[PDB]
Protein backbone atom coordinates (compact mmCIF):
# COMPACT_ATOMS: atom_id res chain seq x y z
CA UNK A 1 0.00 0.00 0.00
CA UNK A 2 3.04 2.58 0.04
CA UNK A 3 3.83 3.75 -3.62
CA UNK A 4 7.63 3.18 -3.68
CA UNK A 5 7.75 3.68 -7.59
CA UNK A 6 11.25 5.06 -8.43
CA UNK A 7 10.78 6.90 -12.22
CA UNK A 8 13.59 6.20 -13.76
CA UNK A 9 13.22 8.65 -16.94
CA UNK A 10 15.13 7.97 -20.35
CA UNK A 11 16.74 5.59 -17.94
CA UNK A 12 13.54 3.24 -18.66
CA UNK A 13 14.82 2.74 -22.55
CA UNK A 14 17.91 0.79 -21.46
CA UNK A 15 18.54 -2.49 -20.67
CA UNK A 16 22.00 -1.58 -18.94
CA UNK A 17 23.55 1.74 -18.97
CA UNK A 18 27.02 2.26 -17.15
CA UNK A 19 29.20 5.66 -16.73
CA UNK A 20 32.40 3.58 -17.38
CA UNK A 21 32.04 0.97 -19.62
CA UNK A 22 30.44 -2.33 -20.29
CA UNK A 23 32.29 -5.73 -20.65
CA UNK A 24 30.69 -9.24 -22.46
CA UNK A 25 33.04 -12.78 -22.04
CA UNK A 26 30.64 -13.85 -24.57
CA UNK A 27 28.24 -15.30 -25.61
CA UNK A 28 25.99 -12.70 -23.13
CA UNK A 29 22.47 -12.11 -24.62
CA UNK A 30 20.15 -8.49 -24.11
CA UNK A 31 17.58 -7.74 -25.07
CA UNK A 32 17.00 -3.69 -24.84
CA UNK A 33 19.56 -1.17 -25.50
CA UNK A 34 22.78 -0.35 -23.83
CA UNK A 35 24.80 2.72 -23.12
CA UNK A 36 27.78 4.14 -21.59
CA UNK A 37 28.56 8.14 -20.70
CA UNK A 38 30.50 9.72 -20.59
CA UNK A 39 32.73 6.91 -21.23
CA UNK A 40 33.97 6.63 -25.01
CA UNK A 41 32.60 3.35 -27.06
CA UNK A 42 36.74 2.29 -26.53
CA UNK A 43 34.73 1.30 -22.78
CA UNK A 44 32.03 -0.95 -24.35
CA UNK A 45 34.43 -4.68 -25.04
CA UNK A 46 33.58 -7.89 -25.67
CA UNK A 47 31.10 -7.38 -28.18
CA UNK A 48 32.17 -7.14 -31.58
CA UNK A 49 30.38 -3.72 -32.47
CA UNK A 50 29.34 -2.48 -36.35
CA UNK A 51 28.78 1.07 -36.13
CA UNK A 52 26.22 2.29 -38.23
CA UNK A 53 24.05 4.07 -40.44
CA UNK A 54 27.35 6.76 -36.81
CA UNK A 55 24.66 7.01 -34.07
CA UNK A 56 24.98 4.03 -32.51
CA UNK A 57 26.14 0.24 -33.32
CA UNK A 58 25.21 -3.34 -33.10
CA UNK A 59 26.49 -6.44 -31.59
CA UNK A 60 25.10 -10.16 -32.25
CA UNK A 61 24.79 -10.41 -28.52
CA UNK A 62 22.41 -7.62 -28.12
CA UNK A 63 19.14 -7.43 -29.53
CA UNK A 64 18.62 -3.42 -29.91
CA UNK A 65 21.16 -0.72 -29.80
CA UNK A 66 24.33 -0.03 -27.96
CA UNK A 67 25.46 3.86 -27.76
CA UNK A 68 28.47 5.33 -25.99
CA UNK A 69 29.45 9.47 -25.66
CA UNK A 70 31.52 10.00 -28.87
CA UNK A 71 28.84 8.90 -30.96
CA UNK A 72 27.03 11.17 -33.08
CA UNK A 73 23.81 13.76 -32.04
CA UNK A 74 21.82 13.14 -30.74
CA UNK A 75 23.43 10.40 -29.15
CA UNK A 76 25.59 12.15 -26.94
CA UNK A 77 22.58 14.24 -25.12
CA UNK A 78 20.39 11.33 -25.34
CA UNK A 79 22.82 9.35 -23.25
CA UNK A 80 22.91 12.03 -20.64
CA UNK A 81 19.57 12.60 -20.16
CA UNK A 82 19.78 8.75 -19.30
CA UNK A 83 22.66 8.94 -17.11
CA UNK A 84 21.26 11.90 -15.01
CA UNK A 85 17.72 10.71 -14.72
CA UNK A 86 19.42 7.11 -13.76
CA UNK A 87 21.20 9.12 -11.16
CA UNK A 88 18.19 10.96 -9.87
CA UNK A 89 16.18 7.31 -9.64
CA UNK A 90 19.39 6.10 -7.46
CA UNK A 91 18.94 9.09 -5.08
CA UNK A 92 15.23 8.70 -4.85
CA UNK A 93 15.47 5.26 -3.87
CA UNK A 94 18.12 6.28 -1.21
CA UNK A 95 15.55 9.04 -0.25
CA UNK A 96 12.67 7.05 0.99
CA UNK A 97 12.11 7.31 4.98
CA UNK A 98 11.13 5.00 7.50
CA UNK A 99 12.04 1.64 6.54
CA UNK A 100 9.10 -1.04 7.13
CA UNK A 101 12.06 -3.42 7.34
CA UNK A 102 15.78 -2.41 8.91
CA UNK A 103 18.67 -4.77 9.42
CA UNK A 104 16.32 -8.14 8.22
CA UNK A 105 18.18 -11.26 8.60
CA UNK A 106 21.49 -9.33 9.77
CA UNK A 107 22.03 -9.02 5.98
CA UNK A 108 21.33 -12.11 5.11
CA UNK A 109 18.34 -13.11 3.25
CA UNK A 110 17.79 -16.90 3.59
CA UNK A 111 14.82 -18.67 2.51
CA UNK A 112 13.28 -15.71 2.34
CA UNK A 113 9.46 -14.43 1.45
CA UNK A 114 9.32 -10.52 1.07
CA UNK A 115 6.06 -8.38 1.37
CA UNK A 116 6.24 -5.70 -0.58
CA UNK A 117 7.89 -2.47 1.28
CA UNK A 118 10.95 -0.49 2.07
CA UNK A 119 13.92 -2.34 3.52
CA UNK A 120 17.19 -1.30 4.37
CA UNK A 121 20.17 -2.32 5.90
CA UNK A 122 23.44 -0.23 6.76
CA UNK A 123 25.62 -3.00 5.83
CA UNK A 124 26.28 -5.77 2.79
CA UNK A 125 23.39 -7.89 2.08
CA UNK A 126 23.48 -11.78 0.70
CA UNK A 127 21.34 -14.06 -0.47
CA UNK A 128 22.41 -17.70 -0.36
CA UNK A 129 19.37 -19.38 -0.93
CA UNK A 130 16.08 -18.41 -3.68
CA UNK A 131 14.33 -15.47 -2.48
CA UNK A 132 10.72 -14.90 -3.53
CA UNK A 133 8.50 -11.27 -3.70
CA UNK A 134 5.15 -12.19 -2.78
CA UNK A 135 2.30 -9.18 -3.44
CA UNK A 136 0.45 -8.11 -5.95
CA UNK A 137 0.92 -6.51 -9.55
CA UNK A 138 1.10 -2.97 -8.25
CA UNK A 139 2.85 -3.25 -5.26
CA UNK A 140 6.27 -1.75 -4.79
CA UNK A 141 9.74 -3.01 -3.06
CA UNK A 142 12.57 -0.89 -2.53
CA UNK A 143 15.81 -2.25 -1.10
CA UNK A 144 18.86 0.78 0.55
CA UNK A 145 21.73 -1.23 0.67
CA UNK A 146 25.00 0.43 2.29
CA UNK A 147 27.37 -1.90 1.46
CA UNK A 148 27.78 -4.77 -1.62
CA UNK A 149 24.84 -7.27 -2.84
CA UNK A 150 25.74 -10.81 -3.78
CA UNK A 151 23.89 -13.38 -5.08
CA UNK A 152 25.02 -17.01 -4.12
CA UNK A 153 25.71 -19.44 -7.75
CA UNK A 154 22.26 -21.03 -8.83
CA UNK A 155 20.05 -18.75 -6.43
CA UNK A 156 16.92 -17.77 -8.36
CA UNK A 157 14.64 -14.60 -7.51
CA UNK A 158 10.41 -16.09 -8.04
CA UNK A 159 8.02 -13.72 -7.83
CA UNK A 160 4.29 -14.81 -6.62
CA UNK A 161 0.76 -13.10 -5.74
CA UNK A 162 0.85 -11.04 -9.09
CA UNK A 163 4.32 -9.55 -8.32
CA UNK A 164 6.23 -7.63 -11.69
CA UNK A 165 9.91 -6.73 -11.65
CA UNK A 166 9.06 -3.43 -12.85
CA UNK A 167 8.30 -2.87 -9.38
CA UNK A 168 11.49 -3.94 -7.45
CA UNK A 169 14.35 -1.85 -7.18
CA UNK A 170 17.54 -2.15 -5.38
CA UNK A 171 19.85 0.37 -4.20
CA UNK A 172 23.32 -0.38 -3.30
CA UNK A 173 26.40 1.12 -2.50
CA UNK A 174 29.34 -1.09 -3.05
CA UNK A 175 29.87 -3.82 -5.61
CA UNK A 176 27.19 -6.28 -6.81
CA UNK A 177 27.72 -9.18 -7.18
CA UNK A 178 25.43 -12.58 -9.15
CA UNK A 179 26.32 -15.40 -8.56
CA UNK A 180 26.99 -17.58 -11.54
CA UNK A 181 23.98 -19.21 -12.83
CA UNK A 182 21.92 -17.31 -10.26
CA UNK A 183 18.36 -15.26 -11.32
CA UNK A 184 17.66 -11.99 -11.01
CA UNK A 185 14.78 -9.88 -11.47
CA UNK A 186 14.27 -6.05 -10.93
CA UNK A 187 16.03 -2.61 -11.41
CA UNK A 188 19.32 -2.05 -10.29
CA UNK A 189 20.46 0.95 -9.31
CA UNK A 190 24.36 0.11 -8.59
CA UNK A 191 26.42 2.86 -7.27
CA UNK A 192 29.29 1.23 -7.95
CA UNK A 193 30.99 -1.90 -9.99
CA UNK A 194 27.99 -4.79 -11.31
CA UNK A 195 29.21 -8.09 -12.39
CA UNK A 196 26.88 -10.81 -13.88
CA UNK A 197 28.82 -14.20 -13.63
CA UNK A 198 29.14 -16.44 -15.58
CA UNK A 199 25.30 -18.02 -17.41
CA UNK A 200 23.27 -15.85 -14.94
CA UNK A 201 20.08 -13.98 -16.17
CA UNK A 202 18.15 -10.81 -15.06
CA UNK A 203 14.52 -9.83 -16.01
CA UNK A 204 14.98 -5.78 -15.31
CA UNK A 205 17.59 -3.47 -15.93
CA UNK A 206 20.91 -2.36 -14.76
CA UNK A 207 22.07 0.80 -13.90
CA UNK A 208 25.78 1.86 -12.68
CA UNK A 209 27.20 4.95 -11.65
CA UNK A 210 30.78 3.00 -13.09
CA UNK A 211 31.65 -0.60 -14.53
CA UNK A 212 29.15 -3.28 -16.08
CA UNK A 213 30.85 -6.61 -16.21
CA UNK A 214 28.84 -9.36 -18.42
CA UNK A 215 29.95 -13.33 -18.41
CA UNK A 216 28.04 -15.16 -20.43
CA UNK A 217 25.07 -13.62 -19.18
CA UNK A 218 21.07 -12.57 -20.04
CA UNK A 219 19.54 -9.42 -19.68
CA UNK A 220 16.01 -9.26 -20.24
CA UNK A 221 14.33 -5.57 -20.15
CA UNK A 222 11.01 -4.25 -20.51
CA UNK A 223 9.73 -3.29 -24.36
CA UNK A 224 9.99 0.11 -24.82
CA UNK A 225 6.73 1.46 -27.00
CA UNK A 226 7.79 3.71 -30.11
CA UNK A 227 6.36 6.96 -29.99
CA UNK A 228 3.29 7.46 -32.43
CA UNK A 229 3.68 10.22 -35.44
CA UNK A 230 0.97 12.84 -36.56
CA UNK A 231 1.25 12.59 -40.74
CA UNK B 1 14.99 34.26 -1.33
CA UNK B 2 12.13 32.15 -2.52
CA UNK B 3 13.69 29.46 -5.22
CA UNK B 4 10.80 29.35 -8.46
CA UNK B 5 13.47 28.04 -10.43
CA UNK B 6 11.61 25.44 -13.10
CA UNK B 7 13.16 22.39 -14.31
CA UNK B 8 13.48 21.55 -17.68
CA UNK B 9 15.11 18.40 -17.98
CA UNK B 10 15.59 17.70 -22.14
CA UNK B 11 13.79 20.22 -22.75
CA UNK B 12 16.79 22.55 -22.40
CA UNK B 13 18.49 21.26 -25.31
CA UNK B 14 15.89 23.14 -27.69
CA UNK B 15 15.69 26.88 -28.40
CA UNK B 16 12.37 25.65 -30.09
CA UNK B 17 10.03 22.69 -29.17
CA UNK B 18 6.75 22.04 -30.13
CA UNK B 19 4.05 19.36 -30.32
CA UNK B 20 2.07 19.89 -33.53
CA UNK B 21 4.94 22.02 -35.68
CA UNK B 22 7.23 25.17 -36.30
CA UNK B 23 6.95 27.96 -38.96
CA UNK B 24 9.11 30.61 -40.59
CA UNK B 25 8.91 33.37 -43.09
CA UNK B 26 11.99 33.46 -43.93
CA UNK B 27 14.77 34.55 -42.91
CA UNK B 28 14.40 33.22 -39.31
CA UNK B 29 17.54 32.97 -36.73
CA UNK B 30 17.28 30.35 -34.11
CA UNK B 31 20.41 29.87 -32.70
CA UNK B 32 19.87 26.28 -30.71
CA UNK B 33 18.04 23.09 -31.83
CA UNK B 34 14.42 22.76 -33.08
CA UNK B 35 11.89 20.06 -32.81
CA UNK B 36 8.41 18.37 -33.15
CA UNK B 37 6.94 15.80 -31.33
CA UNK B 38 4.59 13.75 -31.98
CA UNK B 39 4.04 15.73 -35.34
CA UNK B 40 6.56 14.91 -38.25
CA UNK B 41 8.98 16.70 -40.59
CA UNK B 42 5.91 17.59 -42.97
CA UNK B 43 4.98 20.00 -40.20
CA UNK B 44 8.05 22.03 -39.85
CA UNK B 45 7.96 24.73 -42.68
CA UNK B 46 9.47 27.89 -44.29
CA UNK B 47 12.89 26.40 -43.42
CA UNK B 48 14.49 25.07 -46.05
CA UNK B 49 15.57 21.47 -44.41
CA UNK B 50 18.06 19.68 -45.86
CA UNK B 51 18.50 15.69 -44.13
CA UNK B 52 21.89 11.26 -41.55
CA UNK B 53 18.13 10.55 -41.04
CA UNK B 54 18.16 11.45 -37.31
CA UNK B 55 18.16 15.02 -38.02
CA UNK B 56 17.83 17.37 -40.71
CA UNK B 57 20.04 21.03 -40.82
CA UNK B 58 18.33 24.66 -42.08
CA UNK B 59 20.45 28.35 -42.90
CA UNK B 60 17.80 29.67 -40.44
CA UNK B 61 18.94 27.41 -37.50
CA UNK B 62 22.38 27.14 -35.62
CA UNK B 63 21.73 23.17 -34.28
CA UNK B 64 19.81 20.33 -35.52
CA UNK B 65 16.11 20.09 -36.65
CA UNK B 66 14.50 16.82 -35.03
CA UNK B 67 11.12 15.21 -36.06
CA UNK B 68 8.96 12.49 -34.59
CA UNK B 69 9.33 10.47 -37.92
CA UNK B 70 12.97 10.88 -37.93
CA UNK B 71 15.50 7.46 -37.03
CA UNK B 72 16.50 6.11 -34.11
CA UNK B 73 17.15 7.48 -31.12
CA UNK B 74 15.21 10.27 -32.67
CA UNK B 75 12.25 9.80 -31.51
CA UNK B 76 13.33 8.54 -28.02
CA UNK B 77 14.98 11.75 -27.40
CA UNK B 78 12.11 13.79 -28.79
CA UNK B 79 9.47 11.86 -26.86
CA UNK B 80 11.73 12.63 -23.49
CA UNK B 81 11.99 16.39 -24.11
CA UNK B 82 8.10 16.67 -24.54
CA UNK B 83 7.25 15.22 -21.30
CA UNK B 84 9.79 16.90 -19.39
CA UNK B 85 8.43 20.21 -21.18
CA UNK B 86 5.23 19.67 -20.39
CA UNK B 87 6.36 18.38 -16.68
CA UNK B 88 8.08 22.00 -16.40
CA UNK B 89 4.89 23.49 -17.79
CA UNK B 90 3.24 21.81 -14.80
CA UNK B 91 5.62 22.87 -12.26
CA UNK B 92 5.20 27.09 -13.34
CA UNK B 93 1.50 26.48 -13.08
CA UNK B 94 1.87 24.43 -9.65
CA UNK B 95 3.71 27.01 -7.46
CA UNK B 96 0.99 28.18 -4.38
CA UNK B 97 0.88 31.44 -2.71
CA UNK B 98 1.58 34.34 -5.33
CA UNK B 99 3.16 36.87 -4.08
CA UNK B 100 1.27 39.47 -6.73
CA UNK B 101 -2.45 38.32 -7.94
CA UNK B 102 -3.97 40.43 -10.97
CA UNK B 103 -1.22 43.22 -11.21
CA UNK B 104 -2.71 45.76 -13.34
CA UNK B 105 -5.58 43.91 -13.96
CA UNK B 106 -3.82 42.13 -16.41
CA UNK B 107 -2.49 45.32 -18.29
CA UNK B 108 1.51 45.97 -17.10
CA UNK B 109 2.14 49.38 -18.28
CA UNK B 110 5.23 51.11 -17.06
CA UNK B 111 6.08 47.99 -14.49
CA UNK B 112 9.30 46.86 -13.09
CA UNK B 113 8.92 43.86 -11.26
CA UNK B 114 10.48 42.60 -8.26
CA UNK B 115 11.46 38.71 -7.74
CA UNK B 116 8.65 36.35 -6.88
CA UNK B 117 5.34 34.63 -8.57
CA UNK B 118 2.82 36.42 -9.96
CA UNK B 119 -0.80 35.25 -10.98
CA UNK B 120 -3.21 36.28 -13.27
CA UNK B 121 -6.94 34.13 -14.08
CA UNK B 122 -7.36 36.22 -16.75
CA UNK B 123 -5.12 37.08 -20.22
CA UNK B 124 -2.16 39.63 -19.53
CA UNK B 125 -1.26 42.44 -22.23
CA UNK B 126 2.30 43.96 -21.98
CA UNK B 127 1.51 47.63 -23.67
CA UNK B 128 5.29 49.04 -22.84
CA UNK B 129 8.30 48.06 -22.20
CA UNK B 130 8.53 45.55 -19.17
CA UNK B 131 11.86 45.21 -16.48
CA UNK B 132 12.70 42.57 -14.32
CA UNK B 133 14.64 44.00 -11.19
CA UNK B 134 16.68 41.94 -8.63
CA UNK B 135 20.10 40.20 -9.28
CA UNK B 136 21.61 37.16 -10.86
CA UNK B 137 20.12 34.55 -8.85
CA UNK B 138 16.83 36.03 -8.32
CA UNK B 139 13.91 34.20 -9.97
CA UNK B 140 10.20 35.03 -11.32
CA UNK B 141 7.59 32.66 -12.62
CA UNK B 142 4.57 34.49 -14.25
CA UNK B 143 1.17 31.97 -14.11
CA UNK B 144 -1.44 33.44 -16.89
CA UNK B 145 -4.52 31.42 -17.46
CA UNK B 146 -5.65 33.63 -20.28
CA UNK B 147 -3.41 34.74 -22.84
CA UNK B 148 -0.58 36.91 -23.56
CA UNK B 149 0.41 39.09 -25.97
CA UNK B 150 3.42 42.48 -26.10
CA UNK B 151 2.57 45.33 -28.05
CA UNK B 152 4.70 46.48 -31.21
CA UNK B 153 7.95 47.40 -30.47
CA UNK B 154 8.22 46.72 -26.67
CA UNK B 155 11.18 45.04 -24.67
CA UNK B 156 11.23 43.27 -21.54
CA UNK B 157 14.52 44.73 -20.04
CA UNK B 158 16.38 42.86 -17.18
CA UNK B 159 18.06 45.45 -14.36
CA UNK B 160 19.92 45.09 -11.13
CA UNK B 161 21.89 41.94 -12.22
CA UNK B 162 18.64 39.74 -13.73
CA UNK B 163 19.32 36.58 -15.62
CA UNK B 164 16.47 35.59 -18.32
CA UNK B 165 17.18 31.74 -17.65
CA UNK B 166 15.61 32.19 -14.11
CA UNK B 167 12.67 34.43 -15.94
CA UNK B 168 9.59 31.67 -16.89
CA UNK B 169 6.22 32.18 -18.30
CA UNK B 170 3.52 29.72 -18.04
CA UNK B 171 0.83 30.86 -20.26
CA UNK B 172 -2.64 28.66 -20.96
CA UNK B 173 -3.87 30.47 -24.16
CA UNK B 174 -1.96 32.07 -27.34
CA UNK B 175 1.16 34.11 -26.76
CA UNK B 176 1.80 36.74 -29.68
CA UNK B 177 4.86 38.88 -29.48
CA UNK B 178 4.21 41.87 -31.38
CA UNK B 179 6.45 42.97 -34.55
CA UNK B 180 9.74 43.96 -33.37
CA UNK B 181 9.40 43.22 -29.85
CA UNK B 182 11.37 41.84 -27.50
CA UNK B 183 10.89 38.70 -25.22
CA UNK B 184 13.19 37.61 -22.61
CA UNK B 185 12.88 34.09 -20.90
CA UNK B 186 11.77 30.78 -20.98
CA UNK B 187 7.99 30.64 -22.57
CA UNK B 188 6.26 27.26 -21.57
CA UNK B 189 3.13 28.07 -23.34
CA UNK B 190 0.14 25.64 -23.76
CA UNK B 191 -1.43 26.58 -26.78
CA UNK B 192 0.07 28.74 -29.92
CA UNK B 193 3.06 31.31 -29.87
CA UNK B 194 3.44 33.63 -32.83
CA UNK B 195 6.72 35.71 -33.02
CA UNK B 196 5.34 38.75 -35.27
CA UNK B 197 8.12 40.61 -37.74
CA UNK B 198 11.50 41.28 -36.41
CA UNK B 199 10.58 40.62 -33.09
CA UNK B 200 13.29 38.68 -31.21
CA UNK B 201 13.58 36.58 -27.95
CA UNK B 202 16.53 35.43 -25.71
CA UNK B 203 14.82 32.34 -24.13
CA UNK B 204 13.23 29.12 -25.38
CA UNK B 205 9.82 28.83 -26.70
CA UNK B 206 8.05 25.44 -25.43
CA UNK B 207 4.91 24.89 -27.30
CA UNK B 208 2.13 22.47 -26.77
CA UNK B 209 0.44 23.28 -29.88
CA UNK B 210 2.34 25.19 -33.12
CA UNK B 211 4.88 27.82 -32.83
CA UNK B 212 5.18 30.30 -36.01
CA UNK B 213 7.94 32.82 -36.25
CA UNK B 214 8.15 36.03 -38.47
CA UNK B 215 11.60 37.34 -39.69
CA UNK B 216 12.29 36.46 -36.34
CA UNK B 217 14.81 35.57 -33.59
CA UNK B 218 15.20 32.96 -30.58
CA UNK B 219 18.41 32.98 -29.19
CA UNK B 220 18.74 30.18 -26.70
CA UNK B 221 21.25 29.50 -23.92
CA UNK B 222 23.57 26.61 -24.62
CA UNK B 223 24.14 24.29 -22.25
CA UNK B 224 27.04 22.01 -23.33
CA UNK B 225 26.77 17.92 -23.85
CA UNK B 226 29.09 15.62 -20.83
CA UNK B 227 33.27 16.13 -21.57
CA UNK B 228 33.99 12.79 -23.12
CA UNK B 229 36.21 10.10 -20.90
CA UNK B 230 38.69 8.71 -23.61
Given at each position: ???????????????????????????????????????????????????????????????????????????????????????????????????????????????????????????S?????????????????????AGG?????????????????????????D?????????????????????????????????????????????????????????
Amino acid sequence: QRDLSVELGVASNFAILAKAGISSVPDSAILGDIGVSPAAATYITGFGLTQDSTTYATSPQVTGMIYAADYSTPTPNYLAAAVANAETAYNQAAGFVDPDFLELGAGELRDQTLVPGLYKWTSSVSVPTDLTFEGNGDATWVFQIAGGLSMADGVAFTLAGGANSTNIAFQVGDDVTVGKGAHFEGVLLAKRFVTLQTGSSLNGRVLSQTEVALQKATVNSPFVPAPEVVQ
